């Protein structure tokens, strides 16, 4: 079939009930992630299409870059991104293929596959270092909104791993300079690890949504921002960001890497893997957020042999053309299949879905719900007892949806009552479901399938 073009159905908005990305036409957009913060550094031409073809096929309509990750940024070519400073006046040379003519090709070969460009203005690092104040951040965002405001497949990011109280008169500077210009285009902040964008910017007109990074620590390593031992819980992120009036879209925006070490530091600490990655996944996303993103330690950082490593990673043991070949990367894809099969503004986090006593740490079940159907991601496995009655229909049909795979199981049909529900596989054995239960009278799933059809496929004609 066709590429989807995602912007055919019109700009991105933030839908009526504050939880949704929608386009104008009303259309959902389901956020899907992939993070190639040194793309326009490390990548050259071929190699953009190459990472950007194998990000389509495995279902990624995002995919974020750090635009600037110094001051001055150098790309593969050896060109610099500024050669008077923040002064843009003469940064295009005739017949020169220049750092930000490199940029524009990222951003037009992600157009063409269908894929918007998250661009991270600048990296939290050079600014935290005070490589760029105040006038600088006005001049710099003028000159990325009028070169990029008429390109459809770009989302503002301001920030990048830093606190929103750290430097916040550059960041707003470069964020009003931006808005000043482009309102066809959404915006947010990325924030420093254990942190979200709400616990500063909430009430900011210039963003859209918030984000938040649950990575990279496990549970009980403070050796902080949040509570002891409530690392690993990503969906304390969605419900602390979304308690904040006005209520506004929330994701995880930068959750533990695949293959990236538990606390990163430390390169013979145990790695996070598919399992992990999954996990904070259905964990976001039903605890009530728009989408999900995700990152691998190889590929965010593009290694290949001869490359020093950042957090553990080895370009002799594995390169990041490799690495796009590992499960978390190509299991992403069940993630955001599974939520646009279902009615998707209505949908709303519902832990009153799970009867009796939930399970602690990876026994939580979690629970979101339409009017007429429910999901209940269950990592462990361990037994459930689920409210029906929340959801519509005298009758309710039930199935099991794999992550791992997407293999969907039909369960049988079931009277509107608290219902015992157990999966047949390992405990803790990487089998984690998606109980999928529908009003009787409503078809989105059928009986009969192994699988879910591409349910994008809706949209595109
Ligand atoms: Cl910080």
Not at 43 to 54: A, G, T, W
Not at 427 to 435: E, F, H, K, P, R
Request: charged content about 25%; overall charge neutral.
């Amino acid at each position: 079939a066709k590429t989807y073009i995602p912007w055919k159905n019109g700009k991105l908005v933030v839908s009526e009930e504050g939880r949704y990305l929608k386009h104008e036409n009303g259309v959902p957009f389901f956020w899907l992630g992939e993070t190639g913060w040194l793309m326009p550094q490390r990548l050259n031409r071929d190699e953009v299409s190459y990472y950007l073809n194998k990000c389509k096929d495995a279902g990624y309509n995002m995919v974020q870059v750090q635009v600037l990750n110094g001051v001055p940024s150098m790309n593969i070519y050896g060109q610099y991104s500024m050669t008077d400073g923040f002064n843009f006046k003469d940064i295009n040379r005739k017949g020169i293929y220049g750092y930000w003519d490199h940029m524009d090709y990222i951003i037009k070969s992600a157009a063409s596959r269908g894929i918007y460009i998250g661009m991270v203005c600048i990296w939290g690092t050079p600014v935290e270092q005070g490589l760029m104040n105040e006038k600088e951040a006005v001049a710099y965002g003028k000159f990325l909104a009028e070169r990029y405001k008429d390109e459809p497949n770009i989302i503002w990011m301001i920030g990048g791993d830093i606190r929103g109280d750290n430097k916040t008169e550059v960041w707003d500077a470069l964020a009003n300079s931006i808005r000043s210009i482009d309102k066809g285009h959404l915006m947010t902040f990325h924030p420093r690890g254990r942190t979200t964008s709400a616990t500063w910017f909430n009430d900011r007109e210039w963003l859209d949504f918030n984000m938040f990074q649950s990575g990279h620590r496990r549970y009980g390593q403070r050796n902080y921002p949040i509570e002891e031992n409530t690392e690993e819980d990503n969906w304390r992120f969605v419900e602390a960001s979304q308690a904040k009036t006005p209520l506004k879209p929330v994701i995880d925006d930068e959750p533990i890497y695949e293959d990236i070490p538990q606390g990163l530091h430390d390169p013979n600490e145990t790695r996070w893997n598919q399992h992990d990655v999954r996990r904070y996944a259905y964990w976001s996303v039903f605890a009530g957020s728009f989408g999900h993103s995700y990152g691998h330690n190889d590929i965010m950082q593009f290694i290949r042999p001869g490359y020093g490593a950042s957090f553990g990673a080895d370009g002799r043991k594995k390169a990041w053309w490799d690495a796009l070949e590992d499960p978390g990367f190509n299991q992403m894809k069940y993630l955001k299949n599974l939520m646009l099969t279902f009615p998707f503004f209505e949908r709303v986090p519902d832990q009153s879905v799970i009867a009796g006593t939930n399970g602690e740490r990876y026994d939580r079940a979690i629970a979101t719900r339409g009017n007429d159907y429910l999901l209940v991601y269950n990592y462990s496995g361990r037994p459930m007892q689920i409210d029906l009655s929340k959801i519509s229909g005298a009758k309710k049909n039930a199935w099991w949806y794999s992550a791992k795979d997407g293999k969907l199981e039909y369960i049988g049909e079931f009277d509107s009552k608290v219902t015992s529900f157990q999966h047949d596989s390992g405990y803790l054995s990487g089998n984690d479901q998606v109980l999928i239960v529908v009003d009787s009278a409503k078809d989105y799933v059928q009986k009969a399938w192994t699988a879910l059809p591409d349910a994008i496929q809706k949209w595109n004609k």
